Amino acid sequence: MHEYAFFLGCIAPNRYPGCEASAIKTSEKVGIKLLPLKGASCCPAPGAFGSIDLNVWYAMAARNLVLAEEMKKDIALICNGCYKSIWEVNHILKHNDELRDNVNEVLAEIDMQFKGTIDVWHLAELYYDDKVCGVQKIKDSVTTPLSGAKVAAHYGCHLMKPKKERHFGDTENPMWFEELIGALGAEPIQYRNKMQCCGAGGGVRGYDIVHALDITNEKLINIQEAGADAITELCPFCQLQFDRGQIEIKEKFGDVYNIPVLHYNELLGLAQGMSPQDLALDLHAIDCTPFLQKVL
Amino acid sequence: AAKSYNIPELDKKLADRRYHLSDTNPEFTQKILKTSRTIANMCYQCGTCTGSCPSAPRSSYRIRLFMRRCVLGLENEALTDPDLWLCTTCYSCTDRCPRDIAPTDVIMAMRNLAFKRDIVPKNFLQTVQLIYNSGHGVPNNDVNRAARTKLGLPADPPTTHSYPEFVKGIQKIIDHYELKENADRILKG
Amino acid sequence: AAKSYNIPELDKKLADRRYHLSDTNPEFTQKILKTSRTIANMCYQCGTCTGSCPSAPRSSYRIRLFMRRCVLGLENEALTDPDLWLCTTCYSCTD
Amino acid sequence: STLFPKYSKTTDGSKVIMEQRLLQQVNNLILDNDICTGCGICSEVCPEEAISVGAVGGVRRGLVDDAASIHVDETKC
Amino acid sequence: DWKPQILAIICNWCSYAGADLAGGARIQYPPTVRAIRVMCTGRVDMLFILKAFVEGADGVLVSGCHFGDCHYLEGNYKAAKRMFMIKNLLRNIGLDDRRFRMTFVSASEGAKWGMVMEDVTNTIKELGPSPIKEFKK
Amino acid sequence: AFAVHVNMERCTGCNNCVVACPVNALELNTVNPSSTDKIYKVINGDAVILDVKHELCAGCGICVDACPYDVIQLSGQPP
Amino acid sequence: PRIGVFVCHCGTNIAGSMSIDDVVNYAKTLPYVAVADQYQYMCSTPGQKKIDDAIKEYNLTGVVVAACSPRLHEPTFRTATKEGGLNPFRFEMANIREQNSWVHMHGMWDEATQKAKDQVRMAVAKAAKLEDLVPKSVPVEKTAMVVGGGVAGMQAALDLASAGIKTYLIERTPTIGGRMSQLDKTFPTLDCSQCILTPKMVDVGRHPNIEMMTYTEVEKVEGYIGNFDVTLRKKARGVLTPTEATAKGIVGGGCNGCGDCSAVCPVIKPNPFEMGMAPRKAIYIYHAQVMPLIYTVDFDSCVKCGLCVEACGDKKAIDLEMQDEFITVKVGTAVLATGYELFPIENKREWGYKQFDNVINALEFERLICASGPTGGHLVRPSDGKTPMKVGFVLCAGSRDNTGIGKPYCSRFCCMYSLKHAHQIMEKIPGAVAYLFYMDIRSFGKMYEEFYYRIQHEGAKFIRGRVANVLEDKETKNLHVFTEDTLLGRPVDVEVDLLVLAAAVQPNEGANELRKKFGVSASQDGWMLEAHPKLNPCGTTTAGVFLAGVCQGPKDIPDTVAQAEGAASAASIPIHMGEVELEPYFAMCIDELCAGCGMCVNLCPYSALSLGEKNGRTVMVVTEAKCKGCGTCGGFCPGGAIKMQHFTTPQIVAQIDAFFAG
Amino acid sequence: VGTAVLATGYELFPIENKREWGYKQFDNVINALEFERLICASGPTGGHLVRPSDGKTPMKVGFVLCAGSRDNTGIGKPYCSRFCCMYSLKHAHQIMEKIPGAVAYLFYMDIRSFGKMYEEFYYRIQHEGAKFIRGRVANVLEDKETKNLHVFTEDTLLGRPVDVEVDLLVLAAAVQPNEGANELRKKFGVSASQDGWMLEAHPKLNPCGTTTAGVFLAGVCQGPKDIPDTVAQAEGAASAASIPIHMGEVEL
Numbered sequence A: 001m002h003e004y005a006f007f008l009g010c011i012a013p014n015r016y017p018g019c020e021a022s023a024i025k026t027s028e029k030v031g032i033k034l035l036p037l038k039g040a041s042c043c044p045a046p047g048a049f050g051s052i053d054l055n056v057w058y059a060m061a062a063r064n065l066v067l068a069e070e071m072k073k074d075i076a077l078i079c080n081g082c083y084k085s086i087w088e089v090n091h092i093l094k095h096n097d098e099l100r101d102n103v104n105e106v107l108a109e110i111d112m113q114f115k116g117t118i119d120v121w122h123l124a125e126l127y128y129d130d131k132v133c134g135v136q137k138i139k140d141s142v143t144t145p146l147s148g149a150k151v152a153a154h155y156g157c158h159l160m161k162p163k164k165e166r167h168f169g170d171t172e173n174p175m176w177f178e179e180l181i182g183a184l185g186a187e188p189i190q191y192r193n194k195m196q197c198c199g200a201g202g203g204v205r206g207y208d209i210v211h212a213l214d215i216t217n218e219k220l221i222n223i224q225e226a227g228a229d230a231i232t233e234l235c236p237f238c239q240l241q242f243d244r245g246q247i248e249i250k251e252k253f254g255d256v257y258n259i260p261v262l263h264y265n266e267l268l269g270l271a272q273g274m275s276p277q278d279l280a281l282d283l284h285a286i287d288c289t290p291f292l293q294k295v296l
Numbered sequence B: 001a002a003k004s005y006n007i008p009e010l011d012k013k014l015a016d017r018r019y020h021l022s023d024t025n026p027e028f029t030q031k032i033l034k035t036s037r038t039i040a041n042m043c044y045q046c047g048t049c050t051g052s053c054p055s056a057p058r059s060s061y062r063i064r065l066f067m068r069r070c071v072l073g074l075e076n077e078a079l080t081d082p083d084l085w086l087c088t089t090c091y092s093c094t095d096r097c098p099r100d101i102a103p104t105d106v107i108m109a110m111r112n113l114a115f116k117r118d119i120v121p122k123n124f125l126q127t128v129q130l131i132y133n134s135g136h137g138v139p140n141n142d143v144n145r146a147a148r149t150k151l152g153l154p155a156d157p158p159t160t161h162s163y164p165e166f167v168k169g170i171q172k173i174i175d176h177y178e179l180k181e182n183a184d185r186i187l188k189g
Numbered sequence C: 001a002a003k004s005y006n007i008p009e010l011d012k013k014l015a016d017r018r019y020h021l022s023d024t025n026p027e028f029t030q031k032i033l034k035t036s037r038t039i040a041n042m043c044y045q046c047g048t049c050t051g052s053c054p055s056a057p058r059s060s061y062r063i064r065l066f067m068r069r070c071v072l073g074l075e076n077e078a079l080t081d082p083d084l085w086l087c088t089t090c091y092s093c094t095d
Numbered sequence D: 001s002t003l004f005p006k007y008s009k010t011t012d013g014s015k016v017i018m019e020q021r022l023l024q025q026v027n028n029l030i031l032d033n034d035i036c037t038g039c040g041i042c043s044e045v046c047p048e049e050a051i052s053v054g055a056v057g058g059v060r061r062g063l064v065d066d067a068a069s070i071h072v073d074e075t076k077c
Numbered sequence E: 001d002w003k004p005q006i007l008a009i010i011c012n013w014c015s016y017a018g019a020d021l022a023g024g025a026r027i028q029y030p031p032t033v034r035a036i037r038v039m040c041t042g043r044v045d046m047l048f049i050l051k052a053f054v055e056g057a058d059g060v061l062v063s064g065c066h067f068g069d070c071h072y073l074e075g076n077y078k079a080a081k082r083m084f085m086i087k088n089l090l091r092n093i094g095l096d097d098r099r100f101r102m103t104f105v106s107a108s109e110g111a112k113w114g115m116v117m118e119d120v121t122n123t124i125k126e127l128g129p130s131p132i133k134e135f136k137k
Numbered sequence F: 001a002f003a004v005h006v007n008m009e010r011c012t013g014c015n016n017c018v019v020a021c022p023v024n025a026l027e028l029n030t031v032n033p034s035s036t037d038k039i040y041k042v043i044n045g046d047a048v049i050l051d052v053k054h055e056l057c058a059g060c061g062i063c064v065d066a067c068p069y070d071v072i073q074l075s076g077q078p079p
Numbered sequence G: 001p002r003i004g005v006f007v008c009h010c011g012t013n014i015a016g017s018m019s020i021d022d023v024v025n026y027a028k029t030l031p032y033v034a035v036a037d038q039y040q041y042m043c044s045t046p047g048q049k050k051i052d053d054a055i056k057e058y059n060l061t062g063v064v065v066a067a068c069s070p071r072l073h074e075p076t077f078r079t080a081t082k083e084g085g086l087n088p089f090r091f092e093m094a095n096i097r098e099q100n101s102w103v104h105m106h107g108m109w110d111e112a113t114q115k116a117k118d119q120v121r122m123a124v125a126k127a128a129k130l131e132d133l134v135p136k137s138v139p140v141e142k143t144a145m146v147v148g149g150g151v152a153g154m155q156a157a158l159d160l161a162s163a164g165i166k167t168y169l170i171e172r173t174p175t176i177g178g179r180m181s182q183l184d185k186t187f188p189t190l191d192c193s194q195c196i197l198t199p200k201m202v203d204v205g206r207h208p209n210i211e212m213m214t215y216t217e218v219e220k221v222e223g224y225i226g227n228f229d230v231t232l233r234k235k236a237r238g239v240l241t242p243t244e245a246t247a248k249g250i251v252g253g254g255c256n257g258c259g260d261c262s263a264v265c266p267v268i269k270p271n272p273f274e275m276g277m278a279p280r281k282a283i284y285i286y287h288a289q290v291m292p293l294i295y296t297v298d299f300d301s302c303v304k305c306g307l308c309v310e311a312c313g314d315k316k317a318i319d320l321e322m323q324d325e326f327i328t329v330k331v332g333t334a335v336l337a338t339g340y341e342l343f344p345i346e347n348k349r350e351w352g353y354k355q356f357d358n359v360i361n362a363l364e365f366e367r368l369i370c371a372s373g374p375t376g377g378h379l380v381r382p383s384d385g386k387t388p389m390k391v392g393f394v395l396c397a398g399s400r401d402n403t404g405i406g407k408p409y410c411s412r413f414c415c416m417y418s419l420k421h422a423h424q425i426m427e428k429i430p431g432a433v434a435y436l437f438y439m440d441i442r443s444f445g446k447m448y449e450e451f452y453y454r455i456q457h458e459g460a461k462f463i464r465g466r467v468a469n470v471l472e473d474k475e476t477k478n479l480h481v482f483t484e485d486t487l488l489g490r491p492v493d494v495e496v497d498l499l500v501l502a503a504a505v506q507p508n509e510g511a512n513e514l515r516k517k518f519g520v521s522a523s524q525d526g527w528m529l530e531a532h533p534k535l536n537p538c539g540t541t542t543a544g545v546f547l548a549g550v551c552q553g554p555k556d557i558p559d560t561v562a563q564a565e566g567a568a569s570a571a572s573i574p575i576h577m578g579e580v581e582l583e584p585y586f587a588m589c590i591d592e593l594c595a596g597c598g599m600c601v602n603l604c605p606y607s608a609l610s611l612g613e614k615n616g617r618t619v620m621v622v623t624e625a626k627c628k629g630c631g632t633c634g635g636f637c638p639g640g641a642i643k644m645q646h647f648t649t650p651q652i653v654a655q656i657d658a659f660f661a662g
Numbered sequence H: 001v002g003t004a005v006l007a008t009g010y011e012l013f014p015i016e017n018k019r020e021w022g023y024k025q026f027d028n029v030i031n032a033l034e035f036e037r038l039i040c041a042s043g044p045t046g047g048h049l050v051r052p053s054d055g056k057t058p059m060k061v062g063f064v065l066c067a068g069s070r071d072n073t074g075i076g077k078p079y080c081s082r083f084c085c086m087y088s089l090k091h092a093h094q095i096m097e098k099i100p101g102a103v104a105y106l107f108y109m110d111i112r113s114f115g116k117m118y119e120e121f122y123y124r125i126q127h128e129g130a131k132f133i134r135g136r137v138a139n140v141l142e143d144k145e146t147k148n149l150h151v152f153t154e155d156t157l158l159g160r161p162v163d164v165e166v167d168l169l170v171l172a173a174a175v176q177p178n179e180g181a182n183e184l185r186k187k188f189g190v191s192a193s194q195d196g197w198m199l200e201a202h203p204k205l206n207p208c209g210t211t212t213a214g215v216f217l218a219g220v221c222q223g224p225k226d227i228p229d230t231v232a233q234a235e236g237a238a239s240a241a242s243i244p245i246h247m248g249e250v251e252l
């Protein structure tokens, strides 16, 4: 049973707690142990806080990293934006000496040092790796087939891009996340421009809601045209956009889709037999009941 | 464009549209290069970045134009552009640039300079306030505490919502860079 | 730019800025060539015309942009532009 | 590189169809997995040594799904 | 009163070409190193280096082609093995082995030749006068 | 020489994959046993395949047909 | 010994960095120096006259010139030393310009003067110990080899043969012609590419002075400028030419190219000439215009069914049991003309080359548009066989790219061939429109700009924007090309029926292996390197090897042919003379110091050293022709039994001693 | 003689005819061979680039590329001169390295760095910091007092007109056949191309020989080229001229 510190950023615990609950339960069912991070905070959200000040972005991400450093554990994440912040600041401060120095003399005011000893993983990346739980182990753990459901994957942008800074391979047409959805028994479908941004990154969600919603609506149109019955995602930002933004699209525009948006951990819980009440699917703006009728 | 008339609407209408060598700020370019950590001066304006941007088809935002402004040193043209905050940082431009430039990193550096000159949307400042107060950009509320309890999780996550002693360290980090002292001042107006 | 919303201010704000091949009017181009009696389809966008225009330094008028619109057939982009009447016909561009 | 020698190996139902595309000319070695019997008189005979024999007992009993009785390297055939 | 005496033995086909290119490009560096110019660095015998160090070279530099880029297919592998062994001998006779180094400079690296010149001069200046000159007496 | 994979999560230790394998049954149940190596042995309650390098299996399907709660997947394609 | 020291000013390039007067006075006070003197331009005729007058007057044994680099002016001053009654090799330079002045210009003058005095002292010390050498002259075999049967190889072979030298033309493939045989029409003249080539192929096939060896490779090369012992692998073609059949005893003949064999062969495989678009049997020719019309057998795919031999009948041209024969050929010079291949553009995933059906590259487009190709010359969509009406051309596909996937250089001809293809589609399909997504149209050659003007006049659309990514419509299989029109200033989404990628070119497969066999180095770009990038673009640093064609860097057919004839001329220079002088830097074994240990023998890359019998003692023997003067053996030998002729240990040690003299 | 090789070279097109760039009328406007002599260390200056108007060192230098080239108006040449983009890059590098703090502005319309290592040279020049403005120069005005040159064009990529004031303007003028070259090629019986250069036997497969037997072309006289291409062409012509001499017979 591999053990990881569970970073747990802002949106999953405070808006979609079923995501974190299913994360812990399903990760324990497969051979992974997710340990609470002691006093972790907002990973300085890369858009809304990196746009303001890169130095304080570095300092806060480094503080989050040195918490798990003192814990002597590897970070595990469930958010693409949190992955950007944590993993990328870890990678930058493992190689840039003057930035290490600057962050360290900022952190020395709170009796705290960064040395760069741990690694950062996304939970879906762990589920895909073969040393850690693999696709076959996921298939083994699945107990409810979830058959006869068309499911559209949204990769997001901060997990895989830029490919010159990550290690997940092709960004033009990846299929790895489609294999994790196929392990659950749901057939993943392909839609036009599947690698498009959801529109919520960089603080655009806050600065220009209509612009962000138009970017989201382009995706929703493509997904409905494909014929999806739900949208899996690996990011609480993207889930919030696809969930709230459907309501804001219904009100600001006149478009109705009613497409449930679920984190992959929530689908994994549904596959492994967790209850909808135990997943808190009532906390989503868009009702999941048609999808539950199909897969149950 | 003959000269300054001091009639504001006519100055706006007949603003000199012609680039002069007095318009270049090499200091601005050097600050951008340092902060962005990218080779931005090596752009040759192929248009791949704009061709990949998801914000371009629905707005006047042109990342290639911002790269050109960076190269030419057009400070007060880049920083005051309201389409500096339409980048979602999706990194498609960086993914595809043939010169290994990070235009989105150039955008991030430009946004930092805009904040230092006090141009910044209010959501950013409100997020600064929230993170200062609780350490969380999206904090917990009563209804989510009730939902977590009904799930079976503790009413608060293991974060600084349940360990408020780390909030003081976060606040010292923010105060060292004076982020709160600038955000509140800008919000006051 | 996702589609037509029929809310006029949002349509104005999210107008599709992206050129499609449905936007080209070859009939418009042929009418322009006939009436102007010039080889307009042979422009290669050097910028000399705009560099010589006396209206360009004080307005948004770009004769090279108008030439590009003519070449691509962008009727309803060229004709409705209010900077179509800022040409003094000084003939420096032609010179 | 060059694309048009498109080598494909599709399991269309119960027939494993091994194909070589060109613009207008194709080549389809089609194995009917309901009639194969697991003998190797197709692997012994292959002049070009492409056909190999797989899980004969499992496939002939129905307990194997992701394979046929025989595997043909359609790039070598 | 003391100026370092550094001696370089540079091959004709990459290190001499690189030094010439640096000169042509007008890359400045201090005038402390004097070169010998053999055809390949395979020509460099160990006794050349040891003779230099016993006559009183404060430093010795041997510059040649990159591995795989020798004009004579493999003559700098022999030189590299010889200089590794020379580094070992100087360490065990108690002379400071950083008085000697072997750099691989291509024909197009005039800038790198200038940087090598600067770094060799700096290192020998830190090290100081060689001890042989007073140990002889 | 195929590859067998045992889903440890639902293996009950029933040992009917060990008893039914005809390569395991070679040692004690053959006249003049030829090879005495064994694919499965139930260690700590789950079936462990000692045949790591996939040299002894013959894709018989006696072990897949034997496990009461299907848990053994047989791969007929090269690993 | 009596040495003269002549210090050049180089016209203030040296006098503006040091004190030439002080250097000259120091040279006068140096030991062994008879005369020291200075001049403004020692490389000029008064400078050589000054050297010669000094030699005659002062009875000089050797000459030291404190001037520019030896790599720049050894031949000049060696010839000046010869003219004057000395050996050329009693001369030594002191580089005080490119290693003293130009690097110690600023704010340091007496330091540069001291460095110059030191360099002059070391040069004088070496020259006081130099002695007479005479360059070795070696005979040159009167044959030549040309590796590569493309336009550059064929032109070089024809040029050498018509100059009268017997020539070998080695081609790995069963036919000569190269890429130009695959081209359909040629920019900017729009001549039928295959048609213009057909005469020259016939000339090569008929020339009595050319030994055309198709379907053959170069296993190994040893030797030097004089004699290259080149071993060739004659791959098993499987079919006999009439000459070989008569030699083997079949009077009726060999292969006449009737085609019955391929009419009956049951195996069907892709044709590499048609870039895989077209079928060909196991016994085959690439196209109907191959020069040796001899019908290779593809033994990797033949099933030995024996139908081909029954079809061939009494001609008996097919030998299904043929094996790789090896031949050793002695040649005087060699010309390398290996050409190029298309860079693998499937690595650029944003342009769905392998993943979308209707995305092709420019050689596949050229085969599809040729009238002899898989189609009847009709461009049709690969996805469904329908005629396209909009075609996009992605220029710079994988080129001028610094991301590490593509090539950082321009491929030179891809702008021109894309213009040609746009013209061809607009003239062959009525109403079809060509869109070129370009980033610097490069029409630089003769009539190229006029070709560009004519294409724009016929109505190709030029969109200045590098393509960002390509999406495939799921149903119509149409391709959505996304970029920005940089001049218009807006993003675009052009939907085309067919997308053509103008991919970069790279050195052919196996070219690095062949150039390592011949001893040629590579460029920064990865192409074969030339002797001097400006004034010697054909010869290489290894003597007797010359470059021709795209193998040295991408070029159009005109530039390739000019380069090929230049290489043929350079390869003919030593063959016509018949003599060639080697540089007397050889190793010479001193036998009554050699102990016969044999340890030096393995230190020679060229195998110039061996153990032999002289006066009963086993000593080492140098093949002075094979030696190249590196000095590895002579730097090894512990007993000092190997002497390097112009860089002897006493000379080098005298230089070291003079450096430490104070 | 048995054979003849023609290698007459080229001259710079008379750019004073393009009046909008005040070549002869403004002191500080020069062309690229005058710039090459001014920058050479053996030239009239001590290798120091100085302004012709007053002898002061320039700090901003403009390079007008395509000056009289790819021009269909009847004044300039309708062809590309091949090497003018490359030599302008060289001159920009030379000024930026010889005068500390000087800036080079290249007003360009298709940078053409096609040869071996040319694209890398272009990359290196941009890295050292030459400004590349994609716009053909419209006209040049001279400041009456400082003698500085106001260059007017549009930055086509930026989308705005520009007015760059430089101390020295260099015109990358087109090249044309040398003086008397037409007389010499009529003496030898060689024809001319559409472009005005000497014509070759077959434009693809015989770029050296002419239609008149025994006469061969070499160098820029057949069309503009860099020194590498010129030398390859020259050796090709020498080989073609040697073919009949070595045989000693030739069949009419």
Ligand SMILES: Cc1cc2nc3c(=O)[nH]c(=O)nc-3n(C[C@H](O)[C@H](O)[C@H](O)COP(=O)(O)OP(=O)(O)OC[C@H]3O[C@@H](n4cnc5c(N)ncnc54)[C@H](O)[C@@H]3O)c2cc1C
Binding pocket: G147, G148, G149, G150, G151, G152, G153, G170, G171, G172, G173, G176, G177, G178, G179, G180, G183, G185, G186, G187, G188, G216, G217, G218, G337, G338, G339, G340, G362, G363, G366, G413, G417, G420, G508, G509, G510, G511, G514, G548, G549, G550, G551, G555, G556, G557, G558, G560
């Ligand atoms: C799509 C396309 C269109 C083009 N169109 C034009 C055009 O219209 N006009 C124009 O002027 N140019 C055109 N070009 C460029 C033109 O093809 C080249 O200039 C020309 O083919 C160079 O010929 P080459 O002999 O040097 O090389 P190649 O033609 O490639 O010939 C090399 C030959 O050497 C052989 N070979 C390789 N390695 C070995 C080895 N180890 N041993 C033996 N033999 C070997 C190869 O099999 C081949 O036969 C085009 C290029 C492309 C890709």
Ligand code: SF4
Binding pocket: B042, B043, B044, B045, B046, B047, B048, B049, B050, B064, B067, B093, B096, B097, B098, B099, B101, B103
């Ligand atoms: S993709 Fe890169 S090179 Fe092209 S315009 Fe954008 S930043 Fe410049």
Ligand code: SF4
Binding pocket: B049, B052, B053, B054, B055, B056, B063, B086, B087, B088, B089, B090, B091, B092, B093, B094, B103, B104
């Ligand atoms: S990172 Fe910003 S500029 Fe780049 S493609 Fe995404 S939205 Fe456009």
Ligand code: SF4
Binding pocket: C042, C043, C044, C045, C046, C047, C048, C049, C050, C064, C067, C093
């Ligand atoms: S119309 Fe304007 S942009 Fe087009 S070629 Fe003429 S001057 Fe240049």
Ligand code: SF4
Binding pocket: C049, C052, C053, C054, C055, C056, C063, C086, C087, C088, C089, C090, C091, C092, C093, C094
């Ligand atoms: S005629 Fe004069 S005003 Fe009109 S576009 Fe031409 S230059 Fe400008």
Ligand code: SF4
Binding pocket: D035, D036, D037, D038, D039, D040, D041, D042, D043, D069, D070
């Ligand atoms: S194994 Fe081969 S020979 Fe046997 S039945 Fe199947 S296809 Fe026929």
Ligand code: SF4
Binding pocket: F004, F020, F021, F022, F023, F024, F039, F056, F057, F058, F059, F060, F061, F062, F063, F064, F074
């Ligand atoms: S398939 Fe047969 S041989 Fe292989 S492990 Fe199962 S029972 Fe044993």
Ligand code: SF4
Binding pocket: F006, F010, F011, F012, F013, F014, F015, F016, F017, F018, F042, F046, F047, F066, F067, F068, F069, F071, F072
């Ligand atoms: S038969 Fe099945 S359940 Fe029993 S031990 Fe074997 S794998 Fe486990």
Ligand code: SF4
Binding pocket: G008, G009, G010, G011, G040, G041, G042, G043, G044, G067, G068, G069, G073, G097
């Ligand atoms: S010999 Fe060398 S230093 Fe002397 S004048 Fe000639 S080039 Fe200059």
Ligand code: SF4
Binding pocket: G239, G254, G255, G256, G257, G258, G259, G260, G261, G262, G294, G295, G311, G312, G315, G316, G317, G318
């Ligand atoms: S049948 Fe014989 S002669 Fe005819 S083409 Fe074939 S091999 Fe040649």
Ligand code: SF4
Binding pocket: G264, G265, G266, G267, G281, G282, G283, G297, G301, G302, G303, G304, G305, G306, G307, G308, G309, G320
């Ligand atoms: S032996 Fe058979 S397979 Fe081979 S070439 Fe002849 S007919 Fe074709």
Ligand code: SF4
Binding pocket: G395, G396, G397, G399, G400, G409, G410, G411, G412, G413, G414, G415, G416, G439, G440, G441, G442, G502
């Ligand atoms: S020749 Fe043209 S298309 Fe080819 S790499 Fe160079 S610029 Fe691009």
Ligand code: SF4
Binding pocket: G589, G593, G594, G595, G596, G597, G598, G599, G600, G601, G619, G620, G636, G637, G638, G639, G640, G641, G642
């Ligand atoms: S020359 Fe030296 S190394 Fe060679 S055999 Fe003689 S003693 Fe040995």
Ligand code: SF4
Binding pocket: E072, G586, G587, G603, G604, G605, G606, G607, G608, G609, G622, G626, G627, G628, G629, G630, G631, G632, G633, G634
């Ligand atoms: S110097 Fe010695 S090792 Fe080098 S080639 Fe000559 S004989 Fe061989």
Ligand code: SF4
Binding pocket: H065, H066, H067, H069, H070, H079, H080, H081, H082, H083, H084, H085, H086, H109, H110, H111, H112, H172
């Ligand atoms: S080489 Fe460059 S500057 Fe010269 S004419 Fe051609 S494009 Fe213009």
Ligand code: FES
Binding pocket: E011, E012, E013, E014, E015, E039, E040, E041, E042, E063, E064, E065, E070, E071, E072, E075, E076
């Ligand atoms: S040629 Fe320089 S190390 Fe051998």
